[PDB]
Amino acid sequence: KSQRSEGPALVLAIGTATPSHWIDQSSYPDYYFRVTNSDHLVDLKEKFRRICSRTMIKKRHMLLTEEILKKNPNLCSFSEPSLDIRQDILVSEIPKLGKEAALKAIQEWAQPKSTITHLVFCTRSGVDMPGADYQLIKLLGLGPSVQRLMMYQQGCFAGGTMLRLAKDLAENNKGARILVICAESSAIGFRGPSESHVDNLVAQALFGDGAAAIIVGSNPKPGLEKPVFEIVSAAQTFVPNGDCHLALHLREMGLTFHCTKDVPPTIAKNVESCLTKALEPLGISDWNSLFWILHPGGNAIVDQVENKLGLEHEKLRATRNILRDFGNMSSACVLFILDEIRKKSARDGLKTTGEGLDFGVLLSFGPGLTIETVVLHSKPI
Amino acid sequence: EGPALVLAIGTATPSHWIDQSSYPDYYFRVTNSDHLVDLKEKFRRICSRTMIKKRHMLLTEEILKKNPNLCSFSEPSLDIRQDILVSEIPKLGKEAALKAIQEWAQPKSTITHLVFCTRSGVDMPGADYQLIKLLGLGPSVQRLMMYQQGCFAGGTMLRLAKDLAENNKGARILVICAESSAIGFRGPSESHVDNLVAQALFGDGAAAIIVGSNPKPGLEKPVFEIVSAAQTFVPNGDCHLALHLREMGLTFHCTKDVPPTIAKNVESCLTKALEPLGISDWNSLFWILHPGGNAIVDQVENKLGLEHEKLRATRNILRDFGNMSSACVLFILDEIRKKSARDGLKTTGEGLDFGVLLSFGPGLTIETVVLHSKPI
Question: Out of B168, B247, B362, whose CB is closest to A130?
Answer without folding.
Answer: B362
